[PDB]
Amino acid sequence: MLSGLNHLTLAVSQLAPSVAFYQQLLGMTLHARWDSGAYLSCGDLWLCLSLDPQRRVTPPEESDYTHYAFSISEADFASFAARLEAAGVAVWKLNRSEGASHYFLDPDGHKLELHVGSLAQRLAACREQPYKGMVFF
Amino acid sequence: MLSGLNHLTLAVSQLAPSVAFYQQLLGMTLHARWDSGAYLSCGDLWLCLSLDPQRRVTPPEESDYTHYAFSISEADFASFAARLEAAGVAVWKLNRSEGASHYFLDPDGHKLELHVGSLAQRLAACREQPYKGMVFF
Ligand SMILES: Nc1cc(-c2ccccc2)no1
Ligand SMILES: Nc1cc(-c2ccccc2)no1
Ligand SMILES: [Mn+2]
Ligand SMILES: [Mn+2]
Numbered sequence A, B: 001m002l003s004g005l006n007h008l009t010l011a012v013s014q015l016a017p018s019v020a021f022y023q024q025l026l027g028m029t030l031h032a033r034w035d036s037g038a039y040l041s042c043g044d045l046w047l048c049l050s051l052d053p054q055r056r057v058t059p060p061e062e063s064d065y066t067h068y069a070f071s072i073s074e075a076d077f078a079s080f081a082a083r084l085e086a087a088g089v090a091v092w093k094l095n096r097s098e099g100a101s102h103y104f105l106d107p108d109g110h111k112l113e114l115h116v117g118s119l120a121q122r123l124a125a126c127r128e129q130p131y132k133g134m135v136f137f
Helices: A015-025 A074-086 A119-128 B015-025 B074-086 B119-128
Strands: A005-012 A029-034 A037-042 A045-051 A067-071 A091-093 A101-105 A111-115 B005-012 B029-034 B037-042 B045-051 B067-071 B091-093 B101-105 B111-115
Touching (some): A005 B111, A015 A029, A029 B119, A074 A101, A111 B005, B015 B029
Antiparallel strands (some): A091 A101, A101 A111, B037 B045, B101 B111
16 A cells, blocks of 8 residues: 655756755755756655756646645744745745645746645544535545 | 645546545545545645646646655555556656656646655665766765
């Protein structure tokens, strides 16, 4: 059976600015780099940046809702969002759901999110106020 | 700071076949389903399937290398891969450039992977068989 996410791999158009974004701006740990990629960690997450000449710098209106959310504590959320804002990182959505969320773009337009709250927290809120058509299992 | 992937959200074009793929075929746990999405877990991974009219069924030659790998044990890897093959699940890559992996597509062409091994194990393997120009930190 499957036991979790093993790794997330993001195709990148330019390796250096992507390493700078994930390591220096977002604070992830850089473990290795090679001519066409890098390995970083963020808590348990194994992130791979893969240099790919097929990656387009993609405006958010031109990509679907697929996105990658990173955990942060409530206490740290506002200062991290302010850090991204200072760095000029673009926002692609405003938060309208439960739990703090900041929706931001990576240099290639990958859709990212900072989120505070677990699946258990979300399910508890949904049980009290179910979405349209919502069924629990 | 950031610690871990909070959740992975995949945009899907048809909710029912996608839920069936992740729950029935891949064995993930379905927690809730509503008219426009579903919440599943795979170990400690929170997966959200989000119905998105913008999602296109995308052939693998039309998308970049961005992909999502799920952990599986050495004992279960081959029989799970063979069952996906026998079920007609499409593939997108054959060459094992990052260890023991099986590369397959979801119904919308999201690039998925079964992988055996941790980041620490991949780094150890790379010390002996490094990618071109590899540096370790
Ligand atoms: N139960 C179930 C099987 C599948 C499937 C999807 C694509 C290809 C082959 C099988 N999806 O759900
Ligand atoms: N065939 C079928 C439909 C469903 C369903 C479950 C929860 C919510 C909406 C639909 N489960 O099986
Ligand atoms: Mn999200
Ligand atoms: Mn991979």
